[PDB]
Amino acid sequence: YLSIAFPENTKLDWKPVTKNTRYCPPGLQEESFLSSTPIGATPSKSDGFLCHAAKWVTTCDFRWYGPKYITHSIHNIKPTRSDCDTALASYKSGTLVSLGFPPESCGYASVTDSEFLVIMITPHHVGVDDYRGHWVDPLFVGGECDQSYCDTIHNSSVWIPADQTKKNICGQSFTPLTVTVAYDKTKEIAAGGIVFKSKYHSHMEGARTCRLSYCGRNGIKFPNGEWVSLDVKTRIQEKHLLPLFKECPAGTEVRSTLQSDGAQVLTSEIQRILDYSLCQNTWDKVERKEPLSPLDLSYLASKSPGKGLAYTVINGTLSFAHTRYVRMWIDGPVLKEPKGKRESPSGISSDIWTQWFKYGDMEIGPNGLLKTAGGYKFPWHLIGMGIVDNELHELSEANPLDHPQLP
Amino acid sequence: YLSIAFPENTKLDWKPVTKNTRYCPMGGEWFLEPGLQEESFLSSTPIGATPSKSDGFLCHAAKWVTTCDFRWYGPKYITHSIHNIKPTRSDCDTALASYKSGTLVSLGFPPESCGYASVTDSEFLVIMITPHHVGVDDYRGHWVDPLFVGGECDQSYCDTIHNSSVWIPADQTKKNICGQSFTPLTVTVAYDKTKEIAAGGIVFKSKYHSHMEGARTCRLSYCGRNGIKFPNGEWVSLDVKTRIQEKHLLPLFKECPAGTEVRSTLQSDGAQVLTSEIQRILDYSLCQNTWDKVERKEPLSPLDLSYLASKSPGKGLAYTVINGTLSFAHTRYVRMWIDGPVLKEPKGKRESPSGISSDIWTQWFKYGDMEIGPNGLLKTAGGYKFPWHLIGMGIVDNELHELSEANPLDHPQLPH
Amino acid sequence: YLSIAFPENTKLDWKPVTKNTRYCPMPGLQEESFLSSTPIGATPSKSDGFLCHAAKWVTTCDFRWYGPKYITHSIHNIKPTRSDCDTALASYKSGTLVSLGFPPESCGYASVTDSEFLVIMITPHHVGVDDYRGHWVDPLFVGGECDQSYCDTIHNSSVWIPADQTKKNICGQSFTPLTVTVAYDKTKEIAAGGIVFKSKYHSHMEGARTCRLSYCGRNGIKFPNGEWVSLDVKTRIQEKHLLPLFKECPAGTEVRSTLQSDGAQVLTSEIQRILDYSLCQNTWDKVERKEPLSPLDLSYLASKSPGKGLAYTVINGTLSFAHTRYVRMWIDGPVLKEPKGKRESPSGISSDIWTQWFKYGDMEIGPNGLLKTAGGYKFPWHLIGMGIVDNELHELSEANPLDHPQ
Ligand SMILES: *[C@@H]1O[C@H](CO)[C@@H](O[C@@H]2O[C@H](CO)[C@@H](O)[C@H](O)[C@H]2NC(C)=O)[C@H](O)[C@H]1NC(C)=O
Ligand SMILES: *[C@@H]1O[C@H](CO[C@@H]2O[C@@H](C)[C@@H](O)[C@@H](O)[C@@H]2O)[C@@H](O)[C@H](O)[C@H]1NC(C)=O
Ligand SMILES: *[C@@H]1O[C@H](CO)[C@@H](O)[C@H](O)[C@H]1NC(C)=O
Ligand SMILES: *[C@@H]1O[C@H](CO)[C@@H](O)[C@H](O)[C@H]1NC(C)=O
């Protein structure tokens, strides 16, 4: 149930650390552009009206002789744009009226009739598909529509959205945002070498960002599902930025970004800070010729996934290694066998480390990992910064998702 | 106005530190790890009230009769009346479903139906659907309105005081009548594998919940589904099927008192789970940073000693220095409210900021020329001073609490 | 594009330290708290209302000398009385409102007489709110606005009524309780400058940039970051009225709401100051051991926030301090090729940051471990890192949504 970063390999090529070497975790370039991210669905946008037209007829049938035969019927007809709009704005003003049936217009030797045009406005809220950029309600033709004048199944009723003006069918309302782009000044701009930043995003990977069209504008979906508005005009390294990214798979869904996101960015920034002054605190200790504890060794290593360094103590000689860090899941802080599930917390138990050195009376692996008669014990700083890394993740995918409506 | 966590007694039984184990407080529930076991269950927590859910309609039935009176002779005597009746279920379902489609129409009064030597009349059945939004009582599980019979109702076909009106909720399908919307959540359960499972030996964790005590958790039924209320007012749904250690879980917990209310779980909650973990960590290395000093035979400062001690309420350790021997003591920590960082008398308000300033400590040892109490508290000629780490970290522990009860509460409506 | 806390002057008068005093950034302060209320965000159900339209539906019976019964139907749009609408309003709320249509016919001889029904129409109509100027806003209103529960419209026969007539001064957004603490010098006369505002959502708000603002009908104070709390003239601090100590806010000033997401700031700042202190003490300890200081060891010692503090260096092996006021500067990167930073604003004014350089290892060293090496001018990593946090804490303070009126 624990998460950790561990060198992927079970053996490393160790090399003694040279005197007065002090490496605790370039040609950077940052460009910022103006952007827009969604706050959450506001249903006030998918409000609408059911426009219903019918003719209320009073026919006066008058033949050879006899009384005045008078009838009342109702003809459901489909209204025109001007028929609805007129009766609509009267609804907006409280002047909408149902006048009822006509007075009698009677005559001789012909069956003729006089009719009234009565338009009905009933308020009606619908659903939205923000991705597919059109409205959705079962009363619609097919269950969806992308027009300002939507046809319904009933021959005589059409639907009008609360606001006829705005030309994009969208559920969520948005907020502006300044998204930063960090890349290598030296190499060609490429989707891979880019890390995205903002005040709500610490280190969002360009390698795993994909182009997604959302609420009628192109934009890009971050690794955790959050999305920013982005058009083909915004250039990075004087090259168009938008095209660099593959398109997102079908049924890819987007999350809203709350103010609650900044809370991660802060604690990541501190964990890096706490961590850094903590490995120095371990080098100061080395420098003083004070022997290193398994706790001390865990201070020195990288603790996040990616190419990094590991350290150990081989016959009093501080040794290090290059290696790539990946995320593993250990069963607890002390294992009976040095095994971890390398690809999923229900994955298989493979050996994580097998190369064991001498350490007094017990043995010691990479970054302060122990092999003791009491089992294989980890360092607590590693476990702990893994518990943070965990919470730090789940909080990123903790936002509300935009689920479209299905016709 | 300042708080710290402090040993409950004013005196402790001190014992010298004997064996060299760097016995540091490892923030969170890692204290009892000689057999901790975690099982997680899938669950649901409230987001906050959504008013859309209490939308509804007032169904009004009426008979519009056109009477044709025709006696011995004379003109066609016609009168118009309207007879208000209570609608039937299918009547409402129809006139409502006519409304959702804009098909509902008021035909008005009937055409004239006349005859001889008898007064006969013709009627229309006119139903009106006028929109009416009501309030909800989520704990007790029913609607609430002044127009209701008794001031509340718990069915999808509610009667009103006026005999000719009934109330229907916008969505007739959903049986639980609940005001706020939910989101899913995965709650972890931690327990000692050795002991019998019980509410006492259980700690609840999630991504919004750092260490919730099972002993201070109680069963509360909410919005038509069983569940448990954590101390901070937040609530997670838990039904009786869920087993921990092959035993029913929900039953382990007592029922929450009447008029106990629940807070929503906003996402802003993670920030507590995060900065709690950071302090649990920082305090660890700081405790070590001092054990290293102990290692090196460097004399310990009053700050050094607060580094060694527990800083959260509950059974922990205290350290002091008895004539050059670093000594520890067992004690349970409580939260106190000191007036400031440096006091004129060793007195603090235990368990409440509006409490009795009582003496916090009385067992004072010699410390160069001044005296020193537990976990680096000094008795000096300048007054009684705390260490600043303890003070600052009480400031954190505080807003962690103060932020824990910071979510909105589900206040039901009280009828009539 | 980076921000840091750096001493304002380019050179200071340093005095060697021999005091054995551990002056780390953590007198006669006194704290008094008052109870208050702040906006959480706009609620749209709060702006709901109704259209009352009164009209007379007349049935006239014209009957002259002779001939058939001539009957006509008309509708006269009329303006309703306050008490007339209320009749149809609670009648609307009960589903009992009815458009009865045209009256039965009342006919007679040698005179034209008519029978009429008073049909009131209630059309639901959602409107806008101006929380600042404290009145509703709509184009249908006379002039486009109104401040009463019975509002006139452009159309002579329509008035607008809000769902709840019991108006608290008509406010679009809803509020919450909050406990605001005031920190001041007990010693000095109380003044707008000497006050710092705290709460569980506000860590150290400067009272000097706070200004009195009236909002949704409650007098109050607008914090520097746009957030606002309700505050009355009754609340006294140091036995003096608090609300009046503060200037009035500029015209068209708008407020942002205060979310729980704020607590996230107040938290990391409390951890920072906890870490810094523990790290700087952790340095004094090093000096106790007479281990030479690294520029890092030195950056642990300095103030990290704008204001009167201390800066440090090491002059000919002697650890030295100086008094100075800290400001926020914007350096181009973590190591510059010229000792230049932009003082008081990120837009322009590239000034020399430091000029007083002492000998160090083989290289020269400025304040708080700033190095002048052949590779450029390197800042410590801690100082840079703490400037990155101190920054986002800023962009996150202003990260809440603000109230735009119509
Ligand atoms: C650390 O200690 C081992 C055990 O002493 C070292 O192994 C060497 O083994 C060779 C071959 O028998 C001998 O020269 C000595 O026994 C050891 N050499 C020295 C210089 O002491 C080796 O240095 C280290 N082992 C590992 C795995 O790093
Ligand atoms: C200093 O403290 C001593 C503590 O009492 C005991 O004596 C020592 C030698 C150990 O046996 C220890 O475990 C005991 O607690 C006092 O005996 C001594 O008198 C004190 N000296 C002073 C006050 O000058
Ligand atoms: C209200 O309800 C009844 C129908 O049950 C209706 O006939 C009458 O108007 C009212 N009841 C009585 C007792 O008058
Ligand atoms: C309001 O009333 C009359 C008719 O009721 C309308 O024609 C006009 O807009 C207003 N009155 C005047 C005198 O302009």
Author numbering:
A (entry chain A): 1 to 25, 34 to 415
B (entry chain B): 1 to 416
C (entry chain C): 1 to 26, 34 to 413
Sentences from the paper on this structure:
In this work, we have characterized the fusion and biochemical properties of CHAV-G and compared them to those of VSV-G. We also determined the structure of a soluble form of CHAV-G ectodomain (CHAV-Gth, generated by thermolysin limited-proteolysis of recombinant VSV particles in which the G gene was replaced by that of CHAV) in the POST conformation at 3.6 Å resolution. In these experiments, we could obtain CHAV-Gth crystals at pH 4.6 and determine the structure of the protein at 3.6 Å resolution by molecular replacement. The single trimer in the asymmetric unit has the three protomers in a classic post-fusion conformation. The three chains were built from residues 1 to 415, 1 to 416 and 1 to 413, for chains A, B and C, respectively; with internal breaks in segments 26–33 and 27–33 of chain A and C. Those breaks reflect the intrinsic flexibility of segment R1. The overall structure of CHAV-Gth is very similar to that of VSVIND-Gth in its post-fusion form. The PHDs are more divergent than FDs and CDs. Only 79 residues of the PHD (called PHD core) out of 90 in CHAV-G are in structurally equivalent positions with VSV-G. The largest differences are confined to helices D and E which are missing in CHAV-G (see the orange arrow on Fig. 3B). A comparison of the sequence of both proteins at these positions reveals that CHAV-G bears an insertion of 4 aa residues at the level of helix E resulting instead in the formation of a small two stranded β-sheet. For CHAV-G, the amino-terminal part of R2 adopts a β-strand conformation, which is followed by a small loop and a small helix; CHAV-G R3 has a structure which is similar to VSV-G R2, a long loop ending in a β-strand.
CHAV single envelope glycoprotein G is involved in two successive steps of virus entry: receptor recognition that allows endocytosis of the virion and fusion of viral and cellular membranes that allows release of the viral nucleocapsid into the cytoplasm for the subsequent steps of infection. G ectodomain folds into three distinct structural domains.
